Design a protein around this ligand. Structure first.
Ligand SMILES: NCCCC[C@H](N)C(=O)NS(=O)(=O)OC[C@H]1O[C@@H](n2cnc3c(N)ncnc32)[C@H](O)[C@@H]1O
Length: 484
RNA sequence: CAGUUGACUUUUAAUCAAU
């Protein structure tokens, strides 16, 4: 125990001996800080409302003791509200010197405006709820370090009330997304995180052991496979907003653990789903902001429908400056190895993802559909019905990052199995990201999955745009870090 | 930088003073 910590405890003892309880069970708060401020919006200075009564409760952020009159600022959930104390008015005024900054306080009184004009709660009765054992770090010199801000988000939320509104806005996004799919005739569902075998995307899984069953399971990397099984089952419209786990590095776009949505629509193509996602995201922004304009890192992202639609091949061929057909992997190897020697030990199929990610992805700041992906990098999308080599798939980009991939689902078992067999070769060759074949899934397709359109959507990434954050850790409440 | 210490009956990164 240090000195300051001990000094706080010595003050607690004084308050306990004085008569108060050390840690009360409850406080009957009647008003919130912002509700008082909103009520007296633009009231003239030196006003009073002794008729009215209020009771607030929060944390002491400031404390300006000026002899026989004391001031303070109470920080609740909503905002800051000023307190006023006086000797021949507030009971046990002497014992206000045993309060410290950081303590949780509850007060009763009436509202009034100072000479300056700020709305203030005239304390007629106070109750020390909690005694903080450490000093509050100010915005000035305490919490500027980003990593300490993440480790102690509680401290962050005290110091920076701006951070509070980020996660509130995050919640509203989900609520809107949910209400949409709910009202659009989709069923919310829960699939297991503990899977025996993974599949749905290219990533390395997490592993874990279970004692009762005595077998090594994997953490789910995608929602697809099990939602696909429900389609086979009979459900036509399903969706889920669950946590997924990919054992990979960390950056502004990628985080090992992340929330993401997946909806599925029986007897529909990727065109049908495209119109839905347009209505979703357009209305979402229009609801949140009021315009179709999303501030993100000093840019105005235009979500006015319809969204711009480009082809994967045509866009790459243009912006990468390719004289040949990019689907030709042999010629792309030549071009790549010469122009991009860093993409030498990258496999031939992934060479498209990497090149598209360099030349095309960053230019897509506005919401842009990227229709007609290659077959090489799409194992779960039914083939294109005109151009050979491509599939019915679109990925929605915005802010120079992928939001929502949407295949037109492959329901042919024979085709699917041979793609899983192709995928199984790539793992033997040398590819950690390519998962293994789910045999039970392939069987589920054999019994017959109806033709459908599946959606994916990174909830965390969509948050970053709408909440306007640089890194992904800024839209995660408690990010993962290496302990010490 | 806070805490301590004592001052101070509309201050708002309250101020002065003491260690
Ligand atoms: N059947 C149609 C496709 C279904 C979705 C598909 N199984 C899938 O998971 N695709 S994904 O691209 O791997 O993930 C979908 C979105 O999830 C987001 N995502 C993916 N990996 C991460 C990570 N690591 N962190 C955060 N967000 C992530 C991102 O927006 C992706 O576009």
């Amino acid at each position: 125990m240090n000195d300051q910590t001990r000094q706080r405890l010595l003050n607690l003892e004084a308050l306990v001996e004085a008569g108060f309880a050390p840690y009360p069970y409850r406080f009957p708060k009647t008003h919130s800080a912002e509700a008082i401020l909103k009520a007296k919006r633009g009231a003239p200075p030196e006003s009073e409302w002794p008729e009215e009564e209020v009771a607030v409760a929060g944390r002491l952020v400031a404390l300006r003791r000026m002899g026989k009159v004391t001031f303070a600022h109470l920080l609740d959930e909503t905002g800051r509200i000023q307190l006023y104390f006086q000797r021949d008015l507030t009971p046990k005024y002497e014992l206000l010197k045993k309060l410290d900054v950081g303590d949780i306080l509850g007060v009763r009184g009436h509202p009034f405006t100072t000479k300056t004009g700020e709305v203030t709660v005239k304390v007629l009765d106070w109750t020390p709820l909690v005694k903080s054992l450490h000093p509050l770090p100010d915005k000035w010199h305490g919490l500027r370090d980003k990593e300490v801000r993440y480790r102690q988000r509680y401290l962050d939320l005290i110091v920076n009330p701006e951070v509070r509104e980020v996660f509130r806005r995050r919640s509203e996004i989900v609520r809107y997304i949910r209400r949409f799919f709910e009202a659009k005739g989709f069923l919310e569902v829960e699939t297991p995180i503990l899977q025996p075998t993974t599949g749905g995307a290219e990533a390395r899984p997490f592993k874990t052991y279970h004692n009762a069953l005595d077998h090594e399971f994997y953490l789910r990397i995608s929602l697809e496979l099990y939602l696909k099984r429900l389609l086979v089952g009979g459900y036509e419209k399903v969706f889920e907003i669950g946590r997924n786990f990919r054992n990979e590095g960390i950056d502004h776009n990628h985080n090992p653990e992340f929330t993401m949505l997946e909806a599925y629509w029986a007897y529909a193509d990727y065109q049908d789903m495209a119109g839905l996602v347009e209505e979703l995201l357009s209305g979402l922004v229009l609801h949140l902001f009021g315009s179709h304009e999303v501030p993100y890192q000093g840019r105005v992202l235009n979500f006015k429908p319809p969204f711009r639609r480009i082809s994967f091949v045509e866009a790459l061929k243009e912006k990468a400056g390719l004289p040949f057909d990019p689907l030709d992997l042999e010629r792309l190897r030549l071009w790549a190895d010469a122009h991009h020697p860093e993409l030498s030990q990258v496999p031939n199929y992934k060479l498209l993802d990497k090149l598209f990610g360099i030349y095309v992805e960053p230019e897509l700041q506005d919401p842009t559909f990227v229709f007609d992906f290659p077959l090489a990098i799409s194992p779960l999308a039914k083939r294109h019905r005109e151009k050979p080599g491509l599939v019915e798939r679109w990925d929605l980009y915005a802010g120079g990052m992928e939001l929502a991939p949407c295949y037109s689902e492959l329901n042919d078992p024979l085709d699917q199995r041979e793609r899983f067999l192709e995928q199984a070769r790539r793992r033997k060759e040398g590819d950690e990201e390519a998962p293994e074949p789910d045999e039970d899934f392939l069987l589920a397709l054999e019994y017959g999955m109806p033709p459908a359109a599946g959606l994916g959507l990174g909830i965390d990434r969509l948050a970053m745009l709408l909440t306007d954050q640089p890194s992904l850790r800024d839209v995660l409440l408690f990010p993962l870090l290496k302990p010490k």
